[PDB]
Amino acid sequence: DPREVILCKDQDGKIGLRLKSIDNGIFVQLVQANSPASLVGLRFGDQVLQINGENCAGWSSDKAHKVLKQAFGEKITMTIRDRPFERTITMHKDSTGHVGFIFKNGKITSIVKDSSAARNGLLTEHNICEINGQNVIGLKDSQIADILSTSGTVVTITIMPAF
């Protein structure tokens, strides 16, 4: 079931959100820290079904951006389907420290044989969204690498297909 959120624009008229057209829907693509969008709990991969009661179906990323900019007043209503493509997988580092994948540009690119990633069905061509409760969207690979390296044995990752 979708949920309704009401966002209040900031001083600058902004909500701290970038949207993207995927498969003829609209998805949240970047949520700024401490923003009108983060306040209402929007996350990378949330699907936006309506903006101010208007269907988003078939909208380009440009159209969606323009609609947000053109919205009358200070509040914007959105109807949201929470992260419809989320998969969260818990892995465990082996006795010598790795969970068993390689990534680049925030995307998993290979899975190591006989590893915890292999055991737990981690997939390639998937974006890394969260690690152990920490949002990593928008982080540099080196920052993601550091989070993985310093993690405790248990490494829980939320992934989504890279569309």
């Binding site: 790795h98 969970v99 068993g100 994948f101 390689i102 990534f103 680049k104 190591v112 690979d141 690498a145 993985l148 390296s149």
Partner: peptide, 4 residues
């Protein structure tokens, strides 16, 4: 990167 390397393996993680």
């Amino acid at each position: 990167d390397s393996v993680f």
